[PDB]
């Protein structure tokens, strides 16, 4: 949906 995602340890 064009929004950044990443591995859960980032927040």
């Amino acid at each position, epitope marked *: 949906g064009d929004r950044a995602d990443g591995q*859960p340890a*980032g927040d």
Partner: antibody
Amino acid sequence: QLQQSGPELVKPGASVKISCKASGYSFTGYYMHWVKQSHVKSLEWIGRIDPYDGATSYNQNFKDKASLTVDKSSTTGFMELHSLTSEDSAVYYCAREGHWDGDWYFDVWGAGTTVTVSS
Amino acid sequence: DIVMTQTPLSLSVTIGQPASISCKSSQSLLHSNGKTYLNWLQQRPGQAPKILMYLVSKLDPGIPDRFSGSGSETDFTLKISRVEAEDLGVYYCLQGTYYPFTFGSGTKLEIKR
């Protein structure tokens, strides 16, 4: 790629702002994270910023120490490090958290900015 | 924060021979969503760290297939089936399951020739 700013001499107690210019991908599409590499080669994650809205998430150990900002119009991310001591001499990396085949991991790194804290 | 302990802390492997590096995490890295966020990076002298493997075993597409990873929820092994000159440097595990991200201390590989 990611292009970091050059190395820095900083007086103790002073601050410095280092930068990380992104090119060739959609800036607001990916988290930009920052990693400290101490001279004994230990890596520690500092935090990350969402370049779309400026939202930051910090490693608790760097809360008072680092602040992440971004300039959309220059697709450049910034880390300012505050009130520096001997323990803040190190190499600082920025890294993009990218995606491949539906998973996320750090897939582009800047080359490092060496900060030396010294009077 | 999660503690990542690597062993051995250094090793020296003859060109063409196998290498094995392990990592243990102080808690299960198996997330609620079924994924296990355990990564391996290599840092060659003069370069930035680089992700070799994510999700315990999934090879980045630019990484040669002599690299492979295995693991349970807490212990992990990176294997190189036959080391080459470019495999030198420091190898790190990294967990992304629990905030905050944490790395191991690094294992320095020397290539014996």
